[PDB]
Amino acid sequence: ALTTISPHDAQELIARGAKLIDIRDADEYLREHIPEADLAPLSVLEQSGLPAKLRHEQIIFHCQAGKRTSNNADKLAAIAAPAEIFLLEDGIDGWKKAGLPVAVNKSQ
């Protein structure tokens, strides 16, 4: 189910109970961390497979500012299956769409 959403409403699903699988770096990005996310890179999505531990009804798949997801966003949707997989409109904004900073090593 190669589908996507808008960086405004997508913040409703996640806030509704949607797991956000970040298929990005870990330590390289350890600096910042979305207000949720769920470490699950191709490595894990492959070696581990579907994010069962982070599987519910509808799971998302994104965490970039436009690179090349569509490349393997198909088999990927089948990797997190059986489940409703979705992509995040080219734009890491979304959560930042409302000028909201992610979880940094120093919040307070």
How far apart CA 63 and CA 92 sit, in angstroms, is 6
User: 63 catalytic, yes or no?
Assistant: yes
DSSP of 21-76: E--S-SSSSTTEE-SS-----HHHHHHT-S-GGG-SSEEEE--SSSS-SGGGSHHH
For residue 101, say if its preceding peptide bond is cis, omega within 30 degrees of 0: no
Place of tokens 């090593």: 105
Q: What is the DSSP letter of 7?
A: T
Catalytic residue selected from 18, 60, 63, 80: 63
Residues forming the active site = 63
